[PDB]
Amino acid sequence: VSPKTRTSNLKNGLTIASESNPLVQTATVGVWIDAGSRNENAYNNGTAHFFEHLAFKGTDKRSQHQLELDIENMGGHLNAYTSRESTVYYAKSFKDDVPKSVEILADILQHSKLAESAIDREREVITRELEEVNKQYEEVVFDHLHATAFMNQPLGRTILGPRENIQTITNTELRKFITENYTADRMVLVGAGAVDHDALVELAEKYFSHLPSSQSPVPLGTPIPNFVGSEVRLRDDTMPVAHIAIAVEGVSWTSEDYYTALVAQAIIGNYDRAVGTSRHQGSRLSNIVSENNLANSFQSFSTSYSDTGLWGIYLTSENTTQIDDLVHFTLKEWNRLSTSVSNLQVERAKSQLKAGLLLSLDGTTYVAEDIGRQLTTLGRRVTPAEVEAKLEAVTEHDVRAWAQKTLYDKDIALVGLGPIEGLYDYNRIRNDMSMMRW
């Protein structure tokens, strides 16, 4: 039994959420914001990521250099990331260095200079990042996957934004974005590890009290996405490994089917030829793939957003003459979620998940990420007891029902990168989304 996550609000509507662990000596405090790239329009796409680069480029008090020094003198580090729906800024420190770190985070969020000179300098750094993501193949694949699945919609946009916008982002647009979006009712100050809740609340009252409140305060994790079955092929014969993602429209955080989709994902599961145990996994797809050397790896995923999701699999393979078999066998394994799954597979996957959802939470950063994610998507921390009950409620009948509505004979978004000559056209892939024998 984990210690209780305490939650308080301020007057502006900032949530403070903390989970203390008197066994560790380090703390992670940070701010989780319910805002990300999805909050931009087409003209200011890239702003949120731009701001992340400038948040560390100096404030009204501390210059860029002073900032660097202040953090170095703390001992820990700061980190930030921007996603489609979420922005995180956190500081890992020592137990008694928490007041410094909260003060620095409050400073970089509220009181950033955003000086024209620095905007101009980062505009080159970010421009170079456009031509170096190209190497991170999984990320390239997933970025195209969102672009095609949510064609011409806000979720379909990249985080970095187009080259054109990077050249035209001004301090004015940056200021406007963080004033409209980084509001107190959309922010959660999270502390995990060696933090006292009451101490953290006092620090919030001291530093985050003059945060803007939004005009219309909706609850945390409040959202219209129209999935497009489609494919992007980025053939590159010079690459040795093919990277393929297949996805269907999945489930939102607050779907009734959220846990059902996780169990279904666990029935297929993950595989990696480099891991010793992977040849012995119970998953049927794992067995087919390992026996036939069809793939180096596959990773099932179920990404959620506030109002939609993507559920699918990411495969990598050097076996370029049997990509057809890899895709064929994968989709026939999905078919069986509709036609064949019994309590056998369902109870096995529930067992694996009941632990997996707790095992993820190792160190203070993972705990803080869990509190922050849940508070900004569901509006509360879900206790392990509730999670265990929701998983227990998933029956074989629920999985079959869900798969038959979500996977069976549905349109897919498909992205292939690399030597994918052997990947058949869209129709033949999509035809494997059903079985004529059933």
């Binding site: 672009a147 990249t158 187009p162 497009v228 992007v232 429209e249 349109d411």
Partner: peptide, 19 residues
Amino acid sequence: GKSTYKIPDFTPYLKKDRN
């Protein structure tokens, strides 16, 4: 003409109620 994340225009053919 350059960015591969800017999906070409398919609006002439996309059905609104496709799902």
